[PDB]
Design a binder for these strands. Sequence first.
RNA 1: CCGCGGCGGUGCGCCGCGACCGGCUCCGGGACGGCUGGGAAGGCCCGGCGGGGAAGGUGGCUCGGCCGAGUGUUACAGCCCC
RNA 2: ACCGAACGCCGGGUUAAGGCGCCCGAUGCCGACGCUCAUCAGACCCCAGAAAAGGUGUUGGUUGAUAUAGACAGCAGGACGGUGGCCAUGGAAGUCGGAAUCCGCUAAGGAGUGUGUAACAACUCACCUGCCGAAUCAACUAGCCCUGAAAAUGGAUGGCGCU
RNA 3: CGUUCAUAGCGACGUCGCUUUUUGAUCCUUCGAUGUCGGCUCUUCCUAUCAUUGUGAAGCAGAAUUCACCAAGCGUUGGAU
RNA 4: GGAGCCUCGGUUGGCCUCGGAUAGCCGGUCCCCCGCGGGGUCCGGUGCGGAGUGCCCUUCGUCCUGGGAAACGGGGCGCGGCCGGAGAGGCGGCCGCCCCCUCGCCCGUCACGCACGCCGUUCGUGGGGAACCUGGCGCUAAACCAUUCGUAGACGACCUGCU
Lengths: 175, 190, 199, 138
Amino acid sequence: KASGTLREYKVVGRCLPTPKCRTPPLYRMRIFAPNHVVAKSRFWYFVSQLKKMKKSSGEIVYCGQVFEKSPLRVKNFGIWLRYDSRSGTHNMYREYRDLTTAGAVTQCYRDMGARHRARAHSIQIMKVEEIAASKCRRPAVKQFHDSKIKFPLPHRVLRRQHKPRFTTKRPNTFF
Amino acid sequence: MKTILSNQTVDIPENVDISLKGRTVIVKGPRGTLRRDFNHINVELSLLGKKKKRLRVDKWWGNRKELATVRTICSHVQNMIKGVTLGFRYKMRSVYAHFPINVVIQENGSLVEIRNFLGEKYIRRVRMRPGVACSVSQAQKDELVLEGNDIELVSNSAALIQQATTVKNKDIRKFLDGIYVSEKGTVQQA
Amino acid sequence: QVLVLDGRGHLLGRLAAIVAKQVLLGRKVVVVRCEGINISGNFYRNKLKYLAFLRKRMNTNPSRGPYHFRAPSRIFWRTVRGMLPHKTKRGQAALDRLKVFDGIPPPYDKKKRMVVPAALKVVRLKPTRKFAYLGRLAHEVGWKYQAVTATLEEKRKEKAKIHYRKKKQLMRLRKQAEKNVEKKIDRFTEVLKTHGFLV
Amino acid sequence: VFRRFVEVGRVAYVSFGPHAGKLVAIVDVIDQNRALVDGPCTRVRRQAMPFKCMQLTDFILKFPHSARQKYVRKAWEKADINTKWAATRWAKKIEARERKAKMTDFDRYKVMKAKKMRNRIIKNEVKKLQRAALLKAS
RNA sequence: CCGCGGCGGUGCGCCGCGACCGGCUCCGGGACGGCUGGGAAGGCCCGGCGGGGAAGGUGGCUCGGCCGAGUGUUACAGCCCC
RNA sequence: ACCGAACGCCGGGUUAAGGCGCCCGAUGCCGACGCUCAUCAGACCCCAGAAAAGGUGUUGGUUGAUAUAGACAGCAGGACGGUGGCCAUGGAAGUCGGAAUCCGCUAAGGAGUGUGUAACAACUCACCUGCCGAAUCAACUAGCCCUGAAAAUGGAUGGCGCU
RNA sequence: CGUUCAUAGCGACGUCGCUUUUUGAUCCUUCGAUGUCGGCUCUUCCUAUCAUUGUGAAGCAGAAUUCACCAAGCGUUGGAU
RNA sequence: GGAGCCUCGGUUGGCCUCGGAUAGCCGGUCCCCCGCGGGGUCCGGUGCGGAGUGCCCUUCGUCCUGGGAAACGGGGCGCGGCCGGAGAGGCGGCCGCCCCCUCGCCCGUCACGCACGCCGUUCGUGGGGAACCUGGCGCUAAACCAUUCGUAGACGACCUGCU
Ligand SMILES: [Mg+2]
Ligand SMILES: [Mg+2]
Ligand SMILES: [Mg+2]
Ligand SMILES: [Mg+2]
Ligand SMILES: [Mg+2]
Ligand SMILES: [Mg+2]
């Protein structure tokens, strides 16, 4: 796994039928990935961990993208992790604030990279759950839970430093 | 993480008049003026209320070390208010097992000659920071009085005459001598 | 045809790189008020960084060895030289286009002078970081003529204050003159805000 | 010492990006650096938008923090923001700048000719004023 | 010799144009298919059914000129949201 | 000798591995989100350099307490008796050590954390209040940073430099 | 251990390092030859600091002192075999 | 003023506050203090900066004549006086007098080799340097050798002396 921005994929697959087990059970998963090719791979990875089931011995029945059902709402996703340190493997519960699940998982991966130097391949997302105003443990997220929210954009540093690469005017950062 | 907002308030007393050129609080009242420039602290020094009753210090999107300044600016302002109203009086008592540290102020407060510390021929002259005025007290035998508006300058000038009288190459648990700060008070209490 | 830049407020390396490419493309550059150039990282940091550079010397005959210029102008000139191919002919030619000054002397004092906002401290550093004035640094490493440069700049600033005051007074007369005349310039002034000035 | 705030319902001018040169009301604040934003009357779909790209005006129209588009449209039209914006000095100098870019070569010539005269009429007024003021000083 | 008629090769030297093909690299238009026979959205509104923040509310306190602004509590809908 | 790719002589295109402040072709993107300040910062396979162990430096996690039945630190008030308890006498009536190790009063104090004593004494270290006014606190864990970290010509993230 | 007290000063059983002023390993370079020990003479560099400057420590009363920090500026000798 | 080798780069100018950045710019002061200005308070304007380098200034065919708006402005390398400027001044400014012109903006009104579609055009330029013809006012040598000296010395060099 690497990244871009991820998409939620629904992948369902079954260990393919034999004489003995004629109608084997289906298994579904929530697989976050850049595209369906790698989603299907990721599915087989998790499915091999849990069940005696490999890509050879099974078939992916349905792989399909899942869209956010409330894009224009702003939600609080609680996301449960399982990374690998340089040392041993670990659990987390992070919280992010986003318009989408996929975005919230992308937003997680980036943080893990930054905060722990945890590379994609090390990480496992277990559950991602949209959560209320309450049931939010993280004060980073809590500070935005407020009706009359108000703040300035204080030391508003300029970009466009090479539209006029040279100039008469020294810039301004108050607005 | 970044804290969306933090702030504090400092209720100035109706005796004092504080004014702020941007981020440079100037506090004036009974005893005199005290300016102090916080250009280097990066905060919103609002000054709200009719009768100009309180000073408010915001600090937007601060990380933990940025949010520590919020209070400290407020505290320095408090001390600035105090200095204008009451003033600061640091009392410091001389100590010795033998050599009775002969102190004597000179120009006004300014200079402090500290003769016969530990039997030393070397007379320690010690200047004061401008505004601070040392004076040898009565009602207490071996004891100095440092008065001034700006606390910083007073307490440093105390430290000058504390460190001046220091013992080299001996057991300082034994040789307890010098002029030490005994009481940090005000000129007038109300 | 000649860039004059006010070295004040600029970052030592960040200005140098911009000057270097300009000088290579044939532009004649003048950097002025070099003591005002200021370098990221705290003062003590950069003092030690200079004092290391001073230690580097050709052991057997230091007279050959690296020439540690003290003057802020010459310091800036040195760092710019580091971003040229200064052993070549073209690199040398390019270096010869550059002109660098401690303070701001008489050809350039009466010239409007630009600012590189991409190398400017206010923009490029976070406000909670520390930085060093290249004047102080130079002063403490040997530079003799800080005080002299300072006094000359006071005189220059006083002389400039007057110039500004007279410019303001003219601008004021211009504004009044327009108000005096605004019926016999009305259908010129109208066309200069159809095609989008004055607004 | 701030006068403009990322408030719910603050109108902001989008400096650059896809929806550049458009007004936009901040619906809700998502994050440190991302707002959930709308411009029903300004042809801007409800979407998240980074603060970087939006610079914020002096118009706080009033609706509740997560209203459903209909209501912010009504708050926009009630205050008549489109008319108010255009009357502002800011919007005028945007308009000015646009016009200058559109200027054809005949147009350009016309202006040159117009300025040539217009500055000459000011210059004589200024010189006279100076000499008269010289007269006052004497 | 004048025809620069028809054909064939050429140009003293420096040039430019044109359309045709080959190979490229870009630009702008438009027209379709599929999906959770896309998801959200918009618009019209009506009838219900609850739950939450939290209000044209009320209330303690504070700040300004009964009104406006700022916190606090129980929470129906006369702000919304689900 | 690594990574890419294997050479007739040229034009146009396109790439690889690598890059794109300037040296130096290319980010002169209004690039996205974090983390980090280092008085030895850090900066790309082979590769030219560091470990154990530390650190309320900062940032994330994990697990648990305790709390309006009024914390937690901070200003202060008691710390006993059954009792020279028993082993140990060389002295240990709480106190060099060790087996013990409960009851009373209880509001509650361990047959005692230490200081110190030949041994006491004296001092010091729960349970509870008074004031103040919301979170507080503990143990782990892992990121960056720092300590750990000493060499001889002057010196090398390639250099300039860079926050 | 240090009367008492693990850590002033030490430090067993264990353990992690650095150094190339020891000696080994090794055999890459040089066998159409790089003059093979010491001493004398002379310069420079390092610090892992003996002394001197400024300091923190003590089982530092003073004196004497070891322990540690900044530190290589200046020194660090005359002789008998 | 005339020719004439050579070296090339260029192909409107910008004649200036200081600075700030969790702030600034301009006014005007009714009012107060200081040396027409400076500082203050108060008020009124601007502030993704229009008293904007996203800027400003300047125009780019020549002439004719015959109206309007604008109109005493420009020139003669026009000429004399009084200034300011020393950081590497190297540039301006302001004042007398002589002669000449009617130039910017609109209109009419014609004409200028119209060189017959085609490249280095267009300027800073009277450029920098080297060799050559005219006027006016100025000038009138030092250096080295040789000689000498000994404060010096390998030799050079150095210090000295000589109507
Ligand atoms: Mg001693
Ligand atoms: Mg020197
Ligand atoms: Mg390979
Ligand atoms: Mg022992
Ligand atoms: Mg040899
Ligand atoms: Mg050392």
